[PDB]
Design a protein around this ligand. Structure first.
Ligand SMILES: [Zn+2]
Ligand SMILES: [Zn+2]
Lengths: 306, 306
């Protein structure tokens, strides 16, 4: 037993990571088949990022202005194109390490693993949730752009995130692999507001079920509630409203533990109104919302990948 | 910026993971050069684990009683031997995926990444500290035995942990790669006490420095203290005593932030005596002690591995 924030094994994504340089800007690219994907602001100087015209900046670039390096090996660039906020660099060599993969646009509340990279080289791996306000709370230093987020299902890597920006508030923003930003963000160094950062209610509930499965039971109360009455409390505490879809997804955890979803809702409501009184739940002193219901089942069942 | 619990990229260790079966017991092995390392209780039935005589049990086993499988490929076992609590299985094929590696026995308080495995297959990766009482708080289900813990420095993997046991208290115990248990534990299903689980004081201090580097500054007080007076408080709260070696290791973080180590000690003492009053530090509502001073510097500097 025990319960930990876990990232997916990252070996499949390590084999795809390259370094992309244009002029004096260097960041990370993702090399799948004969295409390298990277943030389009590889073509930007520090000054350009204040207010870039990406079309006009890219006009000045040719294939040979893009240096793509994998280890100590130069990939030859035979074509380039801008898709929303990503560049796609056609290279003359397919990555022999390409895994079975997909591109997916994930929903708010879903989670994924980030392989933090610098100069094309892997540095570490950690788990992230796409917040309801479409930011992520990550660990990204200068040169980490082009790092990707992904999920693994058996032998298939589902890429869902590419890192582009740190907001002046210290949280992080990026795109799917088609270059479309999550949230209302743009790849420009200007002040950008993410709205209210609400809590992923269905995720908090799955984590409470994981706690019960692992023996943390103290917070189990003897109240129940209703969806509408719980959501009254949830809105007060800036929690996402719980819907029957969310109840449905929690079904298996409800079944395994014998705790009706609305009973857990009443327990969470009490935690929201009373705090934790100096106690912890699965080693944490606040309510954790970056575990999905599938994350819980995955870890309480030991799913493997090949 | 931002600060996250980060595991090392796990691709090098994934390439070494195999499945080992003996009779009806299956667990994980580590395949480096022409040797497979796995916990010796692969030779045990459920009944045997109550009180095993490993020498007498192993006498009954021959090379062919050990099935070692890598993917869909059978490795031929040409020799076996027991080193403390690990078996070493000589195979007739060197792992072509073997990285540069070392075996190291880490010290209490140091950290490492665990690649949780089942049936020889990677399931996820997470960061762990060797607690002062020589347990780890992990996520290990049945069949996770033989999973390893490691650190990566450039192109060299330093294996430091192999998982063997869950204690009846729910924490975890295992060996170095020479088969020697961390702590006073034995590979037997009998009740085993780990002593008092104290807090890794130097680690908490490094994390407070990481907080300051990232803008979390509220806890900075205007007291200082002395090593002896701080340790008076530290013993009351079951904190490891702070030594000048620990002060020395914090030197660079002290230098970068301008906060003398004993000043941070006075801030921690106030947190210990007053709590956090409903606030958080780097997104946590308790004091985190599973980041080493090197973990902080690594993440605030962006060290890469190849
Ligand atoms: Zn960038
Ligand atoms: Zn076992």
């Amino acid at each position: 037993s025990g319960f930990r924030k876990m990232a997916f094994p990252s070996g499949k994504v390590e084999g795809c990571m390259v370094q992309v340089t244009c002029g004096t800007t260097t960041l990370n690219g993702l090399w799948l088949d004969d295409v390298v994907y990277c943030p389009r602001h590889v073509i930007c100087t520090s000054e350009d990022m204040l207010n870039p015209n990406y079309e006009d900046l890219l006009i000045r670039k040719s294939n040979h202005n893009f240096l793509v390096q994998a280890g100590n090996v130069q990939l030859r660039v035979i074509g380039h194109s801008m898709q929303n906020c990503v560049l796609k660099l056609k290279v003359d060599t397919a990555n022999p390490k390409t895994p079975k993969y997909k591109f997916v646009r994930i929903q708010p509340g879903q989670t994924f693993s980030v392989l933090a990279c610098y100069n094309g080289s892997p540095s570490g791996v950690y788990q992230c949730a796409m917040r309801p306000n479409f930011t992520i709370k990550g660990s990204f230093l200068n040169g980490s752009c082009g790092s990707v987020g992904f999920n693994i299902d058996y032998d298939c890597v589902s890429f869902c995130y590419m890192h582009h920006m740190e907001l002046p508030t210290g949280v992080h923003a990026g795109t799917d692999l088609e270059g479309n930003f999550y949230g209302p963000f743009v790849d420009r160094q200007t002040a950008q507001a993410a709205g209210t950062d609400t809590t992923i209610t269905v995720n908090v509930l799955a984590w409470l079920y994981a706690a019960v499965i692992n023996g943390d039971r103290w917070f189990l109360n003897r109240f129940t509630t209703t969806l509408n009455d719980f959501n009254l409390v949830a809105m007060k505490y800036n929690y996402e409203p719980l819907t029957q879809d969310h109840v449905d997804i929690l079904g298996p955890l409800s079944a395994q533990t014998g705790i009706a979803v609305l009973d857990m809702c009443a327990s969470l409501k009490e935690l929201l109104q009373n705090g934790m009184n100096g106690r912890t739940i699965l080693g944490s002193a606040l309510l954790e919302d970056e575990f999905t219901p599938f994350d819980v089942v995955r870890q309480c069942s030991g799913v493997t990948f090949q």
